[PDB]
PDB file of C-alpha atoms and ligand atoms in Angstrom:
ATOM      1  CA  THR A   1     -69.134  -6.936  45.976  1.00 27.66           C
ATOM      2  CA  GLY A   2     -69.640  -3.412  44.929  1.00 25.94           C
ATOM      3  CA  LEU A   3     -70.941  -1.864  41.293  1.00 24.59           C
ATOM      4  CA  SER A   4     -70.011  -2.994  38.436  1.00 27.31           C
ATOM      5  CA  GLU A   5     -69.509  -1.116  34.923  1.00 25.33           C
ATOM      6  CA  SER A   6     -73.236  -2.831  34.121  1.00 26.54           C
ATOM      7  CA  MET A   7     -76.277  -2.277  35.446  1.00 29.12           C
ATOM      8  CA  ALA A   8     -79.289  -4.847  35.383  1.00 31.41           C
ATOM      9  CA  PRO A   9     -81.811  -4.655  38.414  1.00 31.13           C
ATOM     10  CA  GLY A  10     -80.633  -8.036  39.846  1.00 32.98           C
ATOM     11  CA  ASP A  11     -77.321  -6.466  40.505  1.00 32.07           C
ATOM     12  CA  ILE A  12     -78.506  -3.950  42.196  1.00 31.39           C
ATOM     13  CA  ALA A  13     -80.965  -5.864  44.339  1.00 29.44           C
ATOM     14  CA  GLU A  14     -78.117  -8.245  44.940  1.00 30.63           C
ATOM     15  CA  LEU A  15     -76.349  -5.162  46.537  1.00 30.91           C
ATOM     16  CA  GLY A  16     -79.722  -4.474  48.382  1.00 27.57           C
ATOM     17  CA  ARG A  17     -79.151  -7.466  50.455  1.00 26.80           C
ATOM     18  CA  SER A  18     -75.573  -6.535  51.551  1.00 27.97           C
ATOM     19  CA  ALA A  19     -74.464  -5.757  54.889  1.00 28.35           C
ATOM     20  CA  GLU A  20     -70.930  -4.820  53.611  1.00 26.24           C
ATOM     21  CA  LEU A  21     -69.566  -1.416  54.376  1.00 26.00           C
ATOM     22  CA  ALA A  22     -68.533   0.712  51.161  1.00 28.21           C
ATOM     23  CA  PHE A  23     -67.384   3.370  52.502  1.00 23.77           C
ATOM     24  CA  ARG A  24     -67.876   5.941  55.837  1.00 25.75           C
ATOM     25  CA  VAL A  25     -67.732   9.574  55.580  1.00 25.39           C
ATOM     26  CA  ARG A  26     -67.301  12.854  57.674  1.00 22.81           C
ATOM     27  CA  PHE A  27     -68.204  16.132  56.984  1.00 23.83           C
ATOM     28  CA  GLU A  28     -66.199  19.288  58.032  1.00 22.19           C
ATOM     29  CA  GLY A  29     -69.233  21.307  59.104  1.00 23.36           C
ATOM     30  CA  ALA A  30     -73.113  20.052  59.513  1.00 20.47           C
ATOM     31  CA  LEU A  31     -74.531  17.270  58.173  1.00 23.20           C
ATOM     32  CA  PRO A  32     -76.768  18.051  54.954  1.00 24.74           C
ATOM     33  CA  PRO A  33     -79.960  16.689  54.715  1.00 25.73           C
ATOM     34  CA  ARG A  34     -80.462  12.760  53.641  1.00 26.56           C
ATOM     35  CA  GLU A  35     -82.064  14.185  50.499  1.00 25.04           C
ATOM     36  CA  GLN A  36     -78.645  15.850  48.937  1.00 22.37           C
ATOM     37  CA  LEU A  37     -76.748  12.776  50.047  1.00 23.19           C
ATOM     38  CA  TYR A  38     -76.265  10.915  46.617  1.00 24.27           C
ATOM     39  CA  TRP A  39     -73.106   9.756  46.520  1.00 22.74           C
ATOM     40  CA  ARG A  40     -71.951   9.328  42.513  1.00 24.01           C
ATOM     41  CA  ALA A  41     -69.638   6.827  41.451  1.00 23.73           C
ATOM     42  CA  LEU A  42     -70.550   6.373  38.064  1.00 25.43           C
ATOM     43  CA  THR A  43     -72.782   7.118  34.821  1.00 23.05           C
ATOM     44  CA  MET A  44     -74.097   4.617  32.229  1.00 22.22           C
ATOM     45  CA  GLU A  45     -74.514   6.130  28.947  1.00 23.29           C
ATOM     46  CA  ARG A  46     -74.857   2.995  26.730  1.00 24.20           C
ATOM     47  CA  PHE A  47     -77.988   1.160  26.429  1.00 23.53           C
ATOM     48  CA  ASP A  48     -78.176  -2.158  24.556  1.00 23.97           C
ATOM     49  CA  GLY A  49     -82.047  -3.436  25.115  1.00 25.23           C
ATOM     50  CA  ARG A  50     -81.313  -5.308  28.464  1.00 24.25           C
ATOM     51  CA  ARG A  51     -78.936  -3.303  30.371  1.00 24.91           C
ATOM     52  CA  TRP A  52     -77.100   0.049  31.107  1.00 21.73           C
ATOM     53  CA  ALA A  53     -73.098   0.172  30.933  1.00 18.06           C
ATOM     54  CA  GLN A  54     -70.620   2.534  30.898  1.00 16.54           C
ATOM     55  CA  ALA A  55     -68.981   4.056  27.948  1.00 18.02           C
ATOM     56  CA  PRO A  56     -65.448   5.473  27.720  1.00 19.98           C
ATOM     57  CA  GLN A  57     -64.824   8.489  29.103  1.00 21.74           C
ATOM     58  CA  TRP A  58     -61.740  11.404  28.704  1.00 21.57           C
ATOM     59  CA  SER A  59     -60.622  14.252  30.578  1.00 21.96           C
ATOM     60  CA  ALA A  60     -61.121  20.397  29.171  1.00 21.88           C
ATOM     61  CA  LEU A  61     -64.638  19.613  30.330  1.00 21.08           C
ATOM     62  CA  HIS A  62     -66.717  22.720  30.867  1.00 18.91           C
ATOM     63  CA  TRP A  63     -68.348  23.428  34.493  1.00 18.81           C
ATOM     64  CA  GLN A  64     -68.458  26.285  36.448  1.00 19.32           C
ATOM     65  CA  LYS A  65     -68.321  26.372  40.343  1.00 18.82           C
ATOM     66  CA  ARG A  66     -71.353  27.917  41.710  1.00 18.21           C
ATOM     67  CA  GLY A  67     -73.090  27.700  45.502  1.00 13.78           C
ATOM     68  CA  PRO A  68     -72.329  26.213  48.487  1.00 10.99           C
ATOM     69  CA  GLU A  69     -69.068  23.894  48.682  1.00  9.27           C
ATOM     70  CA  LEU A  70     -69.310  20.519  51.062  1.00  6.07           C
ATOM     71  CA  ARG A  71     -66.111  19.300  52.359  1.00  2.84           C
ATOM     72  CA  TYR A  72     -65.425  15.873  53.480  1.00  5.84           C
ATOM     73  CA  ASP A  73     -63.340  13.260  53.994  1.00  4.47           C
ATOM     74  CA  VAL A  74     -64.066  10.048  53.055  1.00  3.33           C
ATOM     75  CA  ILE A  75     -62.060   6.502  53.708  1.00  2.00           C
ATOM     76  CA  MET A  76     -63.142   3.558  50.795  1.00  2.00           C
ATOM     77  CA  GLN A  77     -63.338   0.015  51.080  1.00  2.00           C
ATOM     78  CA  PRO A  78     -61.687  -1.898  48.133  1.00  2.00           C
ATOM     79  CA  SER A  79     -64.014  -2.158  45.332  1.00  2.00           C
ATOM     80  CA  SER A  80     -61.683  -3.411  42.720  1.00  2.00           C
ATOM     81  CA  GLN A  81     -62.718  -0.584  40.078  1.00  2.00           C
ATOM     82  CA  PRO A  82     -61.025   2.869  39.908  1.00  2.00           C
ATOM     83  CA  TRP A  83     -63.885   5.442  40.634  1.00  2.00           C
ATOM     84  CA  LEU A  84     -64.313   7.216  43.732  1.00  2.00           C
ATOM     85  CA  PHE A  85     -67.632   8.293  45.597  1.00  2.00           C
ATOM     86  CA  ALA A  86     -68.558  11.841  46.092  1.00  2.00           C
ATOM     87  CA  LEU A  87     -70.998  13.917  45.613  1.00  2.00           C
ATOM     88  CA  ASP A  88     -71.434  15.761  42.342  1.00  2.00           C
ATOM     89  CA  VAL A  89     -69.511  17.883  41.200  1.00  2.00           C
ATOM     90  CA  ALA A  90     -66.208  16.766  43.101  1.00  2.00           C
ATOM     91  CA  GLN A  91     -62.991  17.902  43.329  1.00  2.00           C
ATOM     92  CA  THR A  92     -60.777  15.638  45.593  1.00  2.00           C
ATOM     93  CA  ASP A  93     -56.888  15.761  46.622  1.00  2.00           C
ATOM     94  CA  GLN A  94     -56.019  12.840  45.302  1.00  2.00           C
ATOM     95  CA  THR A  95     -52.962  13.534  42.523  1.00  2.00           C
ATOM     96  CA  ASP A  96     -53.915  10.492  40.673  1.00  2.00           C
ATOM     97  CA  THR A  97     -57.644  11.114  40.189  1.00  2.00           C
ATOM     98  CA  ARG A  98     -59.541  12.969  37.651  1.00  2.00           C
ATOM     99  CA  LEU A  99     -62.729  14.098  37.030  1.00  2.00           C
ATOM    100  CA  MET A 100     -63.560  12.612  33.971  1.00  2.00           C
ATOM    101  CA  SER A 101     -66.245  13.639  31.071  1.00  2.00           C
ATOM    102  CA  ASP A 102     -69.502  12.410  32.751  1.00  2.00           C
ATOM    103  CA  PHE A 103     -68.400  13.985  35.888  1.00  2.00           C
ATOM    104  CA  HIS A 104     -67.375  10.951  37.849  1.00  2.00           C
ATOM    105  CA  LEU A 105     -63.671  10.208  39.461  1.00  2.00           C
ATOM    106  CA  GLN A 106     -61.523   7.767  38.210  1.00  2.00           C
ATOM    107  CA  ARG A 107     -58.391   7.193  39.881  1.00  2.00           C
ATOM    108  CA  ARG A 108     -55.650   5.639  37.989  1.00  2.00           C
ATOM    109  CA  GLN A 109     -55.684   2.251  39.353  1.00  2.00           C
ATOM    110  CA  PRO A 110     -58.602   0.475  41.017  1.00  2.00           C
ATOM    111  CA  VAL A 111     -59.179   0.442  44.734  1.00  2.00           C
ATOM    112  CA  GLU A 112     -57.605  -2.532  46.302  1.00  2.00           C
ATOM    113  CA  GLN A 113     -56.959  -1.108  49.416  1.00  2.00           C
ATOM    114  CA  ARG A 114     -58.970   0.948  52.022  1.00  2.00           C
ATOM    115  CA  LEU A 115     -58.142   4.462  50.588  1.00  2.00           C
ATOM    116  CA  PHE A 116     -58.656   7.957  52.415  1.00  2.00           C
ATOM    117  CA  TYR A 117     -59.097  10.940  50.427  1.00  2.00           C
ATOM    118  CA  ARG A 118     -60.448  14.367  51.125  1.00  2.00           C
ATOM    119  CA  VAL A 119     -62.660  15.927  48.775  1.00  2.00           C
ATOM    120  CA  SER A 120     -64.620  19.558  47.886  1.00  2.00           C
ATOM    121  CA  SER A 121     -67.856  19.333  46.403  1.00  2.00           C
ATOM    122  CA  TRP A 122     -70.381  21.758  44.556  1.00  2.00           C
ATOM    123  CA  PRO A 123     -73.659  20.418  44.643  1.00  2.00           C
ATOM    124  CA  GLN A 124     -75.180  23.637  42.568  1.00  2.00           C
ATOM    125  CA  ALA A 125     -72.422  23.631  39.843  1.00  2.00           C
ATOM    126  CA  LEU A 126     -73.360  24.657  36.480  1.00  2.00           C
ATOM    127  CA  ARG A 127     -72.380  21.422  34.232  1.00  2.00           C
ATOM    128  CA  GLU A 128     -71.702  21.577  30.703  1.00  2.00           C
ATOM    129  CA  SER A 129     -73.675  24.716  29.834  1.00  2.00           C
ATOM    130  CA  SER A 130     -72.221  24.116  26.345  1.00  2.00           C
ATOM    131  CA  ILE A 131     -71.675  19.659  25.974  1.00  2.00           C
ATOM    132  CA  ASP A 132     -68.861  18.337  24.342  1.00  2.00           C
ATOM    133  CA  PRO A 133     -70.642  17.030  21.113  1.00  2.00           C
ATOM    134  CA  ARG A 134     -69.611  13.450  21.672  1.00  2.00           C
ATOM    135  CA  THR A 135     -71.556  13.409  24.981  1.00  2.00           C
ATOM    136  CA  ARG A 136     -74.553  15.093  23.313  1.00  2.00           C
ATOM    137  CA  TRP A 137     -74.415  12.285  20.784  1.00  2.00           C
ATOM    138  CA  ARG A 138     -73.709   9.652  22.934  1.00  2.00           C
ATOM    139  CA  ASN A 139     -76.415  10.262  25.766  1.00  2.00           C
ATOM    140  CA  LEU A 140     -78.962   9.889  22.498  1.00  2.00           C
ATOM    141  CA  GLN A 141     -78.341   6.338  21.573  1.00  2.00           C
ATOM    142  CA  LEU A 142     -80.912   3.845  21.972  1.00  2.00           C
ATOM    143  CA  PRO A 143     -81.405   0.642  19.777  1.00  2.00           C
ATOM    144  CA  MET A 144     -83.366   0.949  16.744  1.00  2.00           C
ATOM    145  CA  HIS A 145     -85.786  -2.271  17.877  1.00  2.00           C
ATOM    146  CA  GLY A 146     -87.364  -3.158  20.791  1.00  2.00           C
ATOM    147  CA  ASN A 147     -89.463  -1.169  23.234  1.00  2.00           C
ATOM    148  CA  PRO A 148     -91.834   0.169  20.942  1.00  2.00           C
ATOM    149  CA  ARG A 149     -94.653   1.305  23.257  1.00  2.00           C
ATOM    150  CA  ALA A 150     -92.235   3.385  25.055  1.00  2.00           C
ATOM    151  CA  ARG A 151     -90.955   5.157  22.162  1.00  2.00           C
ATOM    152  CA  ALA A 152     -94.266   5.791  20.956  1.00  2.00           C
ATOM    153  CA  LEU A 153     -94.756   7.187  25.056  1.00  2.00           C
ATOM    154  CA  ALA A 154     -91.733   9.323  24.029  1.00  2.00           C
ATOM    155  CA  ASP A 155     -93.167  10.716  21.127  1.00  2.00           C
ATOM    156  CA  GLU A 156     -96.374  12.031  22.361  1.00  2.00           C
ATOM    157  CA  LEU A 157     -94.254  13.457  25.217  1.00  2.00           C
ATOM    158  CA  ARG A 158     -92.489  15.386  22.631  1.00  2.00           C
ATOM    159  CA  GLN A 159     -95.180  16.702  20.470  1.00  2.00           C
ATOM    160  CA  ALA A 160     -97.180  17.858  23.947  1.00  2.00           C
ATOM    161  CA  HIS A 161     -93.952  19.691  25.592  1.00  2.00           C
ATOM    162  CA  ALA A 162     -91.721  21.623  23.539  1.00  2.00           C
ATOM    163  CA  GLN A 163     -89.869  22.418  26.744  1.00  2.00           C
ATOM    164  CA  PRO A 164     -87.719  19.801  28.358  1.00  2.00           C
ATOM    165  CA  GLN A 165     -88.527  20.590  31.997  1.00  2.00           C
ATOM    166  CA  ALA A 166     -92.185  20.437  31.167  1.00  2.00           C
ATOM    167  CA  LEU A 167     -91.624  16.976  29.497  1.00  2.00           C
ATOM    168  CA  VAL A 168     -89.924  15.896  32.438  1.00  2.00           C
ATOM    169  CA  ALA A 169     -92.450  16.824  35.046  1.00  2.00           C
ATOM    170  CA  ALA A 170     -95.137  15.275  32.892  1.00  2.00           C
ATOM    171  CA  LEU A 171     -93.137  11.972  33.148  1.00  2.00           C
ATOM    172  CA  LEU A 172     -92.587  12.218  36.565  1.00  2.00           C
ATOM    173  CA  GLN A 173     -96.122  12.753  37.138  1.00  2.00           C
ATOM    174  CA  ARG A 174     -96.874   9.525  35.190  1.00  2.00           C
ATOM    175  CA  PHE A 175     -94.782   7.830  38.000  1.00  2.00           C
ATOM    176  CA  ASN A 176     -96.500   9.660  40.578  1.00  2.00           C
ATOM    177  CA  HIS A 177    -100.301   9.855  39.235  1.00  2.00           C
ATOM    178  CA  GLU A 178    -100.703   6.107  37.985  1.00  2.00           C
ATOM    179  CA  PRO A 179    -100.549   3.483  40.615  1.00  2.00           C
ATOM    180  CA  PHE A 180     -96.676   2.119  40.384  1.00  2.00           C
ATOM    181  CA  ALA A 181     -95.607  -0.021  43.285  1.00  2.00           C
ATOM    182  CA  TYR A 182     -91.927   0.229  44.546  1.00  2.00           C
ATOM    183  CA  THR A 183     -90.853  -2.980  45.276  1.00  2.00           C
ATOM    184  CA  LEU A 184     -87.572  -5.003  45.982  1.00  2.00           C
ATOM    185  CA  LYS A 185     -88.991  -8.226  44.229  1.00  2.00           C
ATOM    186  CA  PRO A 186     -90.973  -6.697  41.368  1.00  2.00           C
ATOM    187  CA  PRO A 187     -92.285  -8.973  38.366  1.00  2.00           C
ATOM    188  CA  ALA A 188     -90.076 -10.389  35.860  1.00  2.00           C
ATOM    189  CA  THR A 189     -90.355  -8.491  32.828  1.00  2.00           C
ATOM    190  CA  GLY A 190     -89.520  -9.861  28.897  1.00  2.00           C
ATOM    191  CA  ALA A 191     -87.417  -8.564  26.087  1.00  2.00           C
ATOM    192  CA  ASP A 192     -89.325  -5.343  26.417  1.00  2.00           C
ATOM    193  CA  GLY A 193     -88.170  -4.646  29.437  1.00  2.00           C
ATOM    194  CA  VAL A 194     -88.730  -1.011  29.393  1.00  2.00           C
ATOM    195  CA  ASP A 195     -92.212  -1.335  27.789  1.00  2.00           C
ATOM    196  CA  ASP A 196     -92.896  -3.980  30.303  1.00  2.00           C
ATOM    197  CA  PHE A 197     -92.535  -2.324  33.466  1.00  2.00           C
ATOM    198  CA  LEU A 198     -94.169   1.207  32.502  1.00  2.00           C
ATOM    199  CA  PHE A 199     -97.297  -0.035  30.994  1.00  2.00           C
ATOM    200  CA  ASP A 200     -97.932  -3.812  32.355  1.00  2.00           C
ATOM    201  CA  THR A 201     -96.214  -4.406  35.807  1.00  2.00           C
ATOM    202  CA  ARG A 202     -95.468  -0.894  36.806  1.00  2.00           C
ATOM    203  CA  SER A 203     -93.577  -2.760  39.839  1.00  2.00           C
ATOM    204  CA  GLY A 204     -89.864  -2.755  40.290  1.00  2.00           C
ATOM    205  CA  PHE A 205     -87.152  -0.083  41.941  1.00  2.00           C
ATOM    206  CA  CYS A 206     -84.728   2.128  41.700  1.00  2.00           C
ATOM    207  CA  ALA A 207     -82.795   0.389  38.402  1.00  2.00           C
ATOM    208  CA  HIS A 208     -86.460   0.253  36.637  1.00  2.00           C
ATOM    209  CA  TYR A 209     -87.228   3.686  37.454  1.00  2.00           C
ATOM    210  CA  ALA A 210     -84.299   5.284  36.536  1.00  2.00           C
ATOM    211  CA  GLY A 211     -83.510   3.155  33.380  1.00  2.00           C
ATOM    212  CA  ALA A 212     -87.298   3.302  32.182  1.00  2.00           C
ATOM    213  CA  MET A 213     -87.062   7.340  32.440  1.00  2.00           C
ATOM    214  CA  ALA A 214     -83.860   7.664  30.517  1.00  2.00           C
ATOM    215  CA  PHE A 215     -84.749   5.564  28.050  1.00  2.00           C
ATOM    216  CA  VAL A 216     -88.090   7.658  27.143  1.00  2.00           C
ATOM    217  CA  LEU A 217     -86.502  11.094  27.670  1.00  2.00           C
ATOM    218  CA  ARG A 218     -83.572   9.761  25.134  1.00  2.00           C
ATOM    219  CA  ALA A 219     -86.691   8.615  22.795  1.00  2.00           C
ATOM    220  CA  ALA A 220     -88.023  12.052  23.184  1.00  3.91           C
ATOM    221  CA  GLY A 221     -84.913  13.710  21.663  1.00  4.39           C
ATOM    222  CA  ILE A 222     -83.614  14.861  25.512  1.00  6.51           C
ATOM    223  CA  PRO A 223     -80.043  13.639  26.259  1.00  7.62           C
ATOM    224  CA  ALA A 224     -80.244  11.685  29.697  1.00  4.71           C
ATOM    225  CA  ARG A 225     -77.965   9.096  31.078  1.00  6.15           C
ATOM    226  CA  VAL A 226     -78.199   6.553  34.180  1.00  9.47           C
ATOM    227  CA  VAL A 227     -76.593   7.682  37.253  1.00  6.40           C
ATOM    228  CA  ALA A 228     -75.013   4.945  39.452  1.00  7.08           C
ATOM    229  CA  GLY A 229     -73.885   5.161  43.113  1.00  5.51           C
ATOM    230  CA  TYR A 230     -75.386   4.794  46.883  1.00  5.22           C
ATOM    231  CA  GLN A 231     -77.873   7.216  49.046  1.00  7.37           C
ATOM    232  CA  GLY A 232     -78.211   8.349  52.136  1.00  7.59           C
ATOM    233  CA  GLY A 233     -76.083   6.450  54.922  1.00  8.99           C
ATOM    234  CA  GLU A 234     -76.544   5.780  58.632  1.00  8.77           C
ATOM    235  CA  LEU A 235     -74.950   8.245  61.236  1.00  5.66           C
ATOM    236  CA  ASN A 236     -72.559   7.116  64.017  1.00  5.47           C
ATOM    237  CA  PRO A 237     -73.140  10.177  66.605  1.00  3.31           C
ATOM    238  CA  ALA A 238     -70.651   8.519  68.538  1.00  5.90           C
ATOM    239  CA  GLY A 239     -67.993   9.134  65.577  1.00  7.23           C
ATOM    240  CA  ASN A 240     -69.709  11.658  63.904  1.00  8.84           C
ATOM    241  CA  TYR A 241     -69.399   9.884  60.530  1.00  8.87           C
ATOM    242  CA  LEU A 242     -71.749   8.024  57.920  1.00  7.31           C
ATOM    243  CA  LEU A 243     -71.757   4.816  57.330  1.00  8.38           C
ATOM    244  CA  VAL A 244     -72.302   3.799  53.382  1.00  9.99           C
ATOM    245  CA  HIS A 245     -73.215  -0.104  52.767  1.00  9.59           C
ATOM    246  CA  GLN A 246     -74.010  -2.213  50.146  1.00 10.38           C
ATOM    247  CA  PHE A 247     -77.512  -1.892  51.066  1.00 12.62           C
ATOM    248  CA  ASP A 248     -77.741   2.090  50.358  1.00  9.69           C
ATOM    249  CA  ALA A 249     -76.734   1.097  46.283  1.00  8.30           C
ATOM    250  CA  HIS A 250     -79.160   3.597  43.898  1.00  7.44           C
ATOM    251  CA  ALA A 251     -79.615   4.386  40.799  1.00  7.62           C
ATOM    252  CA  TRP A 252     -81.314   7.968  39.372  1.00 11.17           C
ATOM    253  CA  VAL A 253     -81.057  10.091  36.053  1.00 12.43           C
ATOM    254  CA  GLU A 254     -79.554  13.262  34.666  1.00 12.01           C
ATOM    255  CA  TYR A 255     -80.963  14.985  31.611  1.00 13.20           C
ATOM    256  CA  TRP A 256     -79.006  17.720  29.597  1.00 14.64           C
ATOM    257  CA  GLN A 257     -80.277  21.063  27.808  1.00 13.61           C
ATOM    258  CA  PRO A 258     -78.744  23.843  26.450  1.00 14.88           C
ATOM    259  CA  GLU A 259     -77.889  26.991  28.985  1.00 15.01           C
ATOM    260  CA  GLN A 260     -79.250  24.828  32.049  1.00  9.78           C
ATOM    261  CA  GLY A 261     -76.819  22.254  31.283  1.00 11.54           C
ATOM    262  CA  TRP A 262     -76.937  18.528  33.243  1.00  8.69           C
ATOM    263  CA  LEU A 263     -79.812  18.508  35.957  1.00  8.00           C
ATOM    264  CA  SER A 264     -80.149  15.577  38.141  1.00 10.64           C
ATOM    265  CA  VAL A 265     -83.666  13.834  38.852  1.00 10.62           C
ATOM    266  CA  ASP A 266     -84.908  10.673  40.857  1.00 12.45           C
ATOM    267  CA  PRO A 267     -87.865   8.973  39.774  1.00 10.36           C
ATOM    268  CA  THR A 268     -88.038   6.975  42.859  1.00  8.96           C
ATOM    269  CA  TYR A 269     -89.088  10.189  44.520  1.00  8.91           C
ATOM    270  CA  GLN A 270     -92.167  10.014  43.282  1.00  9.77           C
ATOM    271  CA  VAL A 271     -92.992   6.564  44.252  1.00 10.34           C
ATOM    272  CA  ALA A 272     -91.239   5.724  47.508  1.00 12.85           C
ATOM    273  CA  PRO A 273     -90.375   9.386  48.673  1.00 14.06           C
ATOM    274  CA  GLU A 274     -89.554   7.951  52.137  1.00 14.13           C
ATOM    275  CA  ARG A 275     -86.901   5.857  50.956  1.00 15.91           C
ATOM    276  CA  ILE A 276     -84.817   8.860  49.654  1.00 14.22           C
ATOM    277  CA  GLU A 277     -86.046  11.067  52.759  1.00 15.89           C
ATOM    278  CA  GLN A 278     -85.715   9.191  55.947  1.00 12.65           C
TER     279      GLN A 278
HETATM  280  C1  EMC B   1     -81.661  -2.034  46.284  1.00 12.78           C
HETATM  281  C2  EMC B   1     -82.719  -1.530  45.789  1.00 12.78           C
HETATM  282 HG1  EMC B   1     -82.635   0.241  44.773  1.00 12.78          HG
END
């Protein structure tokens, strides 16, 4: 019926089949291009071998406004969850909502009735040029056992690429140069689900790419997490608004380094750029 605190690919696929409305958005000025419309809901910082899940957050979070400010109104359908949707980094007019330590908005109560809120976002904000130690630590967590081939790949990438930007670029280039497939009905994978996807099936959808990428970054010593939300939306020119449906559900990645802070990346773009762009 909506996003939840945990993500396995099957949950995202189920949202992919639903035509239910998640929210509608009206921008104060021009509509941003589709590829900037990443509606962040929550982050998933725990990986247990099988799925990515939300960890506990707290509220000072170090960030700095810079670049353009986007202003828009949202009317949200009931989700039964306490997170609000918004472009990163968001501030809202809701006095019962706070920007949490993973840059997601948490409301005091779950959204059980339609809700209107106003938002200002800074998509180019500097996020944690210095990081909270709990956050850095948490975002390097992996199970000690399982997915050994992906861990081996991470070790290789770490040796060849001392700088995180270069390592991330090489991992993205693997998705782009190897013949990975983007499909909503991929082959099943086993207990080493990261290894199976990366090396054997090489076929999946946004959740596979996001999860595997965050896994390999962590195993290479770069803090990383999965971001869950929606991307894109359908324009209704008669009302000057966008509709965002459950089928717009999407997962991506962000990774941390000193000074530059958190940077977002969508590995789906390496295999299905048309889905993101159009
Ligand atoms: C619902 C396909 Hg990322």
